Structure formats: C-alpha cells, structure tokens
Structure 1
Amino acid sequence: YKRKLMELSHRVLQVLIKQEIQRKSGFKGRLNELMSQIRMQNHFGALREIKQHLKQQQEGVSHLISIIKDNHEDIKLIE
C-alpha cells in the first residue's frame, strides 16, 4: 500500500502540475559508506552501581514529563 501510495502521489502531483500548465496558460560515497555501516550493524545483530542512578534519572524525567503535560493542559484550558 505504501509503495502504491508513492506511485499515486507521483500521479497526483503530475496531474496537479498538468492542471497548472494547461488551464493556467494564456554524498553518494557517503551513501555507500552508510550502507556499509547499516550492513555492519546487521552483522553485529547476528555494572550494578549504575542502575541505581539510571533508575533515579528515569524517575526524575518521569516526574518532569508530568509537569510538562499539566502545563500543556492548562495552556489548553486557557485557550
């Protein structure tokens, strides 16, 4: 469906360019190395003290996001 959506998007953009024409008348190596890197990651596909701090920080952000959402909802009601 998505690729067909791309082809239909091509179709629609072309039809729009057409109704714009007739009636309205009058890097690559970087890409290669990037592919090599993605393939390398695919190949790759085939400390108890830290967890305290990490759980603590996830908890801190978990609290903060709450205030963020509350600010969003208050902004809503004000609007």
Structure 2
Amino acid sequence: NQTTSVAKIAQYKRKLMDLSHRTLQVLIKQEIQRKSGYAIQADEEQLRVQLDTIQGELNAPTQFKGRLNELM
C-alpha cells in the first residue's frame, strides 16, 4: 500500500501547487477588476519596488547567461 501510495502524495502536492497558482491568479484578478478605481497606490508602490528589483535582477544579465550555460 505504501510504496505504489506515494503516488497520491506526489499527485496531491502537484495539485496543490497548481491550485496555488490559480488561487494566486484569482487573488490577483480580484485586485485588478474591483481595484482600479484607479485609487491604487500607497502600499502598492512598495510592492512594486520589491518586484522591480527582483525582476530585471534576475534578468539580466548577468545571470542568465553566463552562468547557466557555462554550466550546461
């Protein structure tokens, strides 16, 4: 029972992550449609500062290129 039941645990976990993505996506669209309104800012920019940082960090440059495929 246990050895081939790992299946349910793994399946459950992936389902969890997909539901998390949809949860987040629904959570996010409830903050664009009710929320503009065009009110939205304040706290938002701080979110937005964090997000900016992380995003092109990543980008750019540096990382990607060099590293991932000197490694591959």
TM-based fold match above 0.5: no
TM-score calculated relative to the size of structure 1: 0.38
TM-score calculated relative to the size of structure 2: 0.42
Return the structure number with greater helix share: 1
Work out which structure has the larger RCO, using CA pairs closer than 8 Å and 6 or more positions apart in sequence: 2
